[PDB]
Structure 1
Amino acid sequence: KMRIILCDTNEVVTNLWQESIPKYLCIHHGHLQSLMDSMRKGDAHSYAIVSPGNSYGYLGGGFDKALYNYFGGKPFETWFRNQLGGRYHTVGSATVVDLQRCLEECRDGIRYIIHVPTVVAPSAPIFNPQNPLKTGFEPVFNAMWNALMHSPKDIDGLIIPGLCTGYAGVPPIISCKSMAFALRLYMAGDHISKELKNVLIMYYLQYPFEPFFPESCKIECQKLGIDIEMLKSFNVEKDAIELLIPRRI
């Protein structure tokens, strides 16, 4: 019942989202303030917002700078980093910060910030055209998966920006595809077993390893209309994610 709210100032990103995403989903072109201003005319709700910044919790750059300004600036950033323990958080981790404490500064119905670091520090882009998978498709998928897996069950909606497309340098076409795959897996719900979802992620990320593909899952693929041969050779740079998750599901 959770609503997914995709928000980005780059029309390139928002257009791609519209084209890739099969109400349950909202796409907003503009800044965070713009999104909050438009949701107010209908907020007459609890939300979590994804902060895909750095390993230290500093809030600068693109989307995070917006959160920085929206929640109170420097004093807020200081409070935020302290909630994160003021220490180094590895890329691939996720930490939920409860803003409820503000009531004890508070701002709208946004109660949680899900900290999902995508870079140690923004000293350079993370993307490298030499290996799009390892530095593009994978990091964006992981950040999206983490955001979804750590989203508090009590929220009405999850606000997410165009992951790693800022200083990080991941091309929007790449970022949006991984974000779409993570969302398709999520929206599939229980229609796909937890184990088959594990297998789909494995092949999507190009880590083909048969021993981790149980017979029960092959049986499920046939039942679901998922072509096992195309799955085993899935190439994210050439194949449609629809092959992995038929819209029928």
Structure 2
Amino acid sequence: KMRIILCDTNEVVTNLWQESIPKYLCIHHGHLQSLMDSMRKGDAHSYAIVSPGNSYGYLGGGFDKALYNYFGGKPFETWFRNQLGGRYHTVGSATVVDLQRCLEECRDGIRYIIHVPTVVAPSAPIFNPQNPLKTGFEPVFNAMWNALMHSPKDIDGLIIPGLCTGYAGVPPIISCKSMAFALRLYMAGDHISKELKNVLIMYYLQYPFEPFFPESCKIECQKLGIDIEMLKSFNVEKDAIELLIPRRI
């Protein structure tokens, strides 16, 4: 029902998205502005856009800079930061800013900005090749999951750029995989129980804790064609997400 639009200027990110994502989803290789421009030929809708930002709400670089220029510049940023409460927001959290209040600076059909802090500050990248899981796969999954979970149920579409693939420094090959997995779970809709999706996330992130894998979910894996053994040994570095969520689902 909700159209997901992945947008990025980096070809590496868009190509990987195409290669890993099975209408309800669109991929735009280019600037946010070019997407918004062509977004006026089909309408003659309400959207939310994901902001991979910092813990303080400043919109001075990367994707956020696009938003900065598009919505009003400095005065907008000042307004934006105050909507966020003006204080430190932790990475792993998400806050929705409703632009509807633009009626005392409105723009296009975007009513919401889903602010997801991906870095405390852009003083350095978050990624460390020594642990691509803790500084790559996990943080990216968390940002995508939070973006999807916080998306207002009333919007027509959701605009999302590569997460942590810019100033955060996470390789596209890692980020795109976590983004794809989060999307695949979302796309599965109610075809997979909330609890089983929990388990898939737990093993995808490599936290094999049996106590959190109920028998009912094992029964569900059997019914859905999800190999429990491959699940229990899932290696995000080498295994295809198709093993956790078979395309048939």
Q: Common fold, TM-score beyond 0.5?
A: yes
The 1-side partners of 2:208 and 2:43 are apart by 46
Matched, 1:84 2:70: no
Corresponding residue SS for 2:181? helix
Query: How far off is 1:52 after superposition?
Result: 1.1
The 2-side partners of 1:60 and 1:116 are apart by 15
Query: How far off is 1:248 after superposition?
Result: 0.4
Corresponding residue SS for 1:118? strand
Query: How far off is 1:76 after superposition?
Result: 0.3
The 2-side partners of 1:209 and 1:60 are apart by 41
Aligned-CA RMSD value? 0.5
For structure 2, the residue ranges without an aligned partner over 5 or more in a row are none
Query: How far off is 1:200 after superposition?
Result: 0.2
State how 1:1-249 maps to structure 2 within 5 Å.
1-249=1-249
Query: How far off is 1:36 after superposition?
Result: 0.4
Corresponding residue SS for 2:129? coil
Query: How far off is 1:145 after superposition?
Result: 0.2
Deviations for 1:87-119, whole angstroms, at most 9, x for unmatched residues? 000011110000000023110100000011011
Query: How far off is 1:30 after superposition?
Result: 0.8
Corresponding residue SS for 2:200? helix
Identity of counterpart residues, as a percentage? 100
For structure 1, the residue ranges without an aligned partner over 5 or more in a row are none
The 1-side partners of 2:34 and 2:11 are apart by 14
Aligned length: 249
The 2-side partners of 1:170 and 1:213 are apart by 30
The 1-side partners of 2:95 and 2:163 are apart by 17
Deviations for 1:101-138, whole angstroms, at most 9, x for unmatched residues? 00231101000000110111011000000000000000
Deviations for 1:151-210, whole angstroms, at most 9, x for unmatched residues? 000000000001101111000000100000000000000000000000000000001100
Corresponding residue SS for 1:52? strand
Query: How far off is 1:44 after superposition?
Result: 1.7
Deviations for 1:6-63, whole angstroms, at most 9, x for unmatched residues? 0000011111111100110010011111000011001220000000110000002111
The 2-side partners of 1:105 and 1:248 are apart by 45
The 2-side partners of 1:72 and 1:61 are apart by 15
The 2-side partners of 1:101 and 1:167 are apart by 30
Corresponding residue SS for 1:53? strand
- Structure 1's consecutive aligned runs of 4 or more residues displaced over 4 angstroms after TM superposition are none
The 2-side partners of 1:230 and 1:147 are apart by 28
The 2-side partners of 1:60 and 1:218 are apart by 47
